[PDB]
Amino acid sequence: MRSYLILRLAGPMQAWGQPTFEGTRPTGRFPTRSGLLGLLGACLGIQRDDTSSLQALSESVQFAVRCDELILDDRRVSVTGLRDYHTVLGAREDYRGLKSHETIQTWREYLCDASFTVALWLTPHATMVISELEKAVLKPRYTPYLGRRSCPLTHPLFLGTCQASDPQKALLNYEPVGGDIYSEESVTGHHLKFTARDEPMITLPRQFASREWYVIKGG
Amino acid sequence: DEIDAMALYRAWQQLDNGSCAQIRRVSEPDELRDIPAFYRLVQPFGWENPRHQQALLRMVFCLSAGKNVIRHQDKKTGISLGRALANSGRINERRIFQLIRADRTADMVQLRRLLTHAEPVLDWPLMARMLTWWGKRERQQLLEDFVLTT
Amino acid sequence: NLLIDNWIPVRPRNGGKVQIINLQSLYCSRDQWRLSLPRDDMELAALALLVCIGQIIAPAKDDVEFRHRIMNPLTEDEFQQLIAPWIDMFYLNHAEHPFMQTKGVKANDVTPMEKLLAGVSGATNCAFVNQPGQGEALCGGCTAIALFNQANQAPGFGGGFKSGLRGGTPVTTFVRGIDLRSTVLLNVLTLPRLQKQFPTENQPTWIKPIKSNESIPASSIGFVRGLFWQPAHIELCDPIGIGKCSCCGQESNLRYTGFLKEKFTFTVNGLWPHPHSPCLVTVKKGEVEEKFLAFTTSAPSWTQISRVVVDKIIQNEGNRVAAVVNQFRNIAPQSPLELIMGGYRNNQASILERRHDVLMGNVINEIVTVGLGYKTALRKALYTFAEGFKNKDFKGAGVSVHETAERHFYRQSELLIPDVLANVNFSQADEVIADLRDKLHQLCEMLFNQSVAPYAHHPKLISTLALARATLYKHLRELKP
Amino acid sequence: SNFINIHVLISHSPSCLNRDDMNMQKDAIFGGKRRVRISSQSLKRAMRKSGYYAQNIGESSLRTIHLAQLRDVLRQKLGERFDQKIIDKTLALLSGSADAVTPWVVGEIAWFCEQVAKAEADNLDDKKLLKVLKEDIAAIRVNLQQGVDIALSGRMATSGMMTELGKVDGAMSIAHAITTHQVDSDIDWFTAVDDLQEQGSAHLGTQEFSSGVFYRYANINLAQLQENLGGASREQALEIATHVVHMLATEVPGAKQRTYAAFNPADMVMVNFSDMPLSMANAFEKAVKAKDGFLQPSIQAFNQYWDRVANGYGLNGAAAQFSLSDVDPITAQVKQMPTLEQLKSWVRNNG
Amino acid sequence: SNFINIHVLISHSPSCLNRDDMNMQKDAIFGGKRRVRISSQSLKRAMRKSGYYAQNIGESSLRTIHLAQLRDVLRQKLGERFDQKIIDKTLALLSGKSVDEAEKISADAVTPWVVGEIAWFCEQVAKAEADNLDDKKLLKVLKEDIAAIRVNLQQGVDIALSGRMATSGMMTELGKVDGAMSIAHAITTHQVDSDIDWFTAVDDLQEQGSAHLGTQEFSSGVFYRYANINLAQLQENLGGASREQALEIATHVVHMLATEVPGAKQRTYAAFNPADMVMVNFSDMPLSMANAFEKAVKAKDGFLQPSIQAFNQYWDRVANGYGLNGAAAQFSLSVKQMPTLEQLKSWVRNNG
DNA sequence: TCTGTGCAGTGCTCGATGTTTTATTTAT
């Protein structure tokens, strides 16, 4: 049995990116690999130019994300999408200089009434220990948020720690149970995969490599 | 669980002239709470259950326009209220707007005035179902049915 | 040289590290490769390049040989034989005929490499939302790929710059294989069909240049001149030394940092029979008109199964499959067929949206079929509203509410897809599809109300609104089995 | 603790404070019910462009950054990538005893060092360098005189920042503001009477509007604020934070305010320190029902929620609350402030 | 203090002072309760079209979209000062539309016009072509002194107060005005369930029944009116007027906000009621008192007394909680107390 | 000891222009 660090990602608004080079900023259904690394990298004091420990975090940690349905008054509330018409005045026209446009337009998608429970474990050749990752989520250095800085948390990042055989068995200890799980480690009775391009290329800033979740449906 | 709309329709139809007149002179739905004849009419339809009270007030207040103003006609969904008001060819579209925009109690007052004018032929259990909820959705569908008929 | 030296970004089919191979290593081994770039649109551009290359160097003489080369890699001797007469046309840095370029471009300034990076620039918001310096130094492979992408999939740089033969932003549709080698071979028309496809000047635009302001009959263009068509006057600059490519992140001896361009126009009359794109068939007057498919006001896509969505739209909605797809169906009518596909949604030079499915079942078809049904129900209802809005002499965005709502349809329903796909199996299929219907039914009502909400308390529009909502529920009722 | 949480409940009269590209009020689904929304970016700009901000943040004492005093630490920071010849040449041409240095200052100067290092190698100087880097030099000089604004709100949409360390986030994080209650918006059907037209108007239109008791949430990263102020003190950071508390209570977006005029101050302001910053939005996840207004039940729902989860969420730490209302108070663990100024002083004094 | 906040509590007898597309009373949800509403645009038009405005401020602007009709008005009004050719080109440059002899020429949208301002412009146009100065450079010159243009708004003050935008012509660049007065929609301090009047029209040639039967919504209500004036903005909008000039204009707004009532349905409902409480307060930041009535006022010997009381209590709560100490005065019929409105107005005229 | 015409040097606004769109219409 390995040690797991259990996290809770809850808030009225979330955003988990999909590939884009456009003014449209799309969200997926559950947290990304890159987004979870960034969240951890925020709790730790990692700066954007520190590629060394940026790569040390990525090589040390793997995730498992469970989608949690909001239950209210014994009624189920579904996750909905939200489109924000987001404008910027005096936005940069070039990457150097002070010339700017009057108005630019962007379109940003959010999730509403979404909540997630994240299982976290160490790779066989990890650098850090779950003990110091626990410290980081309890006392973050940079401000933690759900995808975008405008999206605060309504529940503490830290949920618990535990020991278990597989990520599914670990997430079982924490209500609410029943949601679909996406894991970096495969579990025995499941064979479905979820393709994604959310593996941050750390040697190539703001670029992403293809990878795959192992899909584990809830009962 | 659900109000027997036709049973209530029949009960109102074979009501004695006295009890009928006592109910008809009401000027708004809440005044039915002052009428003894009203309680006896709706008691076998679940009045003592608070769940049914607001619905029964609307239903009976619409009926109170008269025994012969609302003519029930069986399905061939069945004729909705919106289509039935348009079928009369007597009601201006502007009065339908004013009806569906009106707030509480005032809406029932204006509705009953429209029923009096239109003397509609409709599916009464279908109208009762509409009166049970009477949400914003039902009011918009009323107006759209009226318009789609004309 | 694209036929000789390494430039193809690959990694093992289920392996790890990226390695840069050459065309011979691909054609002459049972090694399983898959393209690997940071961008899906560039992976598709690369495959298109490879396919167009394999289309001129090795068309099978018959279907029998076609099936043979797929199961059996060529020998290095056969490969060298086939590529021998083509080496002269695939030089990046060359004296008189650079690959897809034009020597002697008259330009006052040097155009940055980002302009070939399709979407990194193009709109006034790009500098604010995108990461800078993606095109400071491009390797040889990425440069050729980018050039090929600009000539085929991307819109022109701006005024005075022309787009590809299929038009601006066409949808490219390839038959998918098990690995890169098979996929390339699978999309090469055999010699017989090649002749039936193209019944001319068969020399490239960078060897036999295009004359300014000339009118060109489409039938007067050879298949290699068309497949490797270059509508723009572009000339690369002198590259630089060893370092990281700012696009792919790989090390490269030569890295380009800029290029020259100039306004250049002409006219291709008629429609060139490009084999890589599906098209729409319309009959105006007595003549038959064809239009290559493109993501116009929406880009139909779902996570994990976008290729299936696009496939069904072609299969069902006057759409016709690509010629390379038509070939595969004839060669193997009973074999299952999935797409490798991509395209852009654009506002002239600006790229608004990218949708690409690049990876190397009947329930999924059923799911997509159901999805498109609700999509169509929504469109007919809101088009009914938009037309009535127009006929009522009203102005504003009310005349296109069916466009926005269609885009929102795919994005809102995409959120349902992961859970649907996760629970699909033999016994649960009918149940999860039924639940999907209820969800999509509810979504259509929500989106209808949302699209129409800004025009509440417009009494003159009540008959238009009522007709539109009645239309919606009529089509929604026809969808429940 | 490192984080300051700021919670505001503010009631607006009929208005349209934030709208989209169809001129409809912005909204959000929360707890399955529609809430009117004022976006993060709208709220933050109302603060950043306000007069109060220009006077207390834009004209701060820590505003100015002197490259002269930073020579030593810059000399050792860039000393392993660059030698003092270039580092000092750069430091002087940009301007014409410091302990620490702001991260973006190091990174942007390091970029200028890369340019002059390549300038000496390419064997060009005089005006040629100052011609090429004319706009770039002008850019950083402006930024060196807006240090508190940059530390608090982050860099501007056009800043001329060049490096990754130049991607400067704000030390304060502002959430989207949403109503505590469900809202069905009203519609204003309007005319425009033409002075030269006899029959009817020259234009007709509609405008969506509503009231709303909004919940505003913001947090401040103190260490980040200090670190981006060249290593300022906790006290100096707490002084900045006092201004944020004031603005989140009083500043309102200007949209539609000329014709709807919803110039309302907050009725409840609460500040609490923590190691983990949390929004108390789930106090209203079950949408607040009206009982003699929405404001009183909202403050009540906010207080009851705090009493229920604060302990388990680790919201032990200094907490204070200001309120215009006499609603039954939170747990006694929260110190009641009778005026806003007393609340702000409580923040200056570290709680 | 740059802002002058104005607070009015005014009670109306049964009436229908402002209605919508279906002739029903305008309303709004505030505190979860329906309030009867009078739009700010209705208030502003009632003031600018009033006799008091005409006597104390001057001429209201000309708001129109019909340039062909405007063309003819200017020719009749500016004919003895300029030749018809100059008048036509001036309108053409400002509106961005071709002014010929067409029966119908339409602007982009409804736009407020000031004759005196147009008169000032055609001077420039005349001098422009006289000095052989083309239109592109004429615009460049005029953009250099917008204050000289804004001095003409002293002939059209309602624009200086309420603003102007244009999307075509030189008005895009030269006529952009951000109004100095902010004003809210008047809402009732209490919940209202509107009354309905069931009426008939008796036909003198019809002995049986009436020729028309109908219904008309109406109600009473104690309304809260709020407005503020940005003095510095008002001075700038008047081409650099003095504070005394701005203060005097503000004083007329105070008077009108307390006495001017929209004319709608007044011929048959006659709710000609003056305000029962007026409150003026100088501040650095605009302050509305609306949240005094977020909890809807319950009746207690009327709505008026408990409304004024609710206003006073909330005023103290805000002043004590936010430590506000801007000058303030209060006139009432039911903080410096003013026995008469006139004393209140002198107070404002004298910078508080 | 300040200032004047030439620059060099360029920061621009100017305008014509590359492309390409359409899908519907209740219930009685």
Ligand SMILES: [Zn+2]
């Ligand atoms: Zn590369």
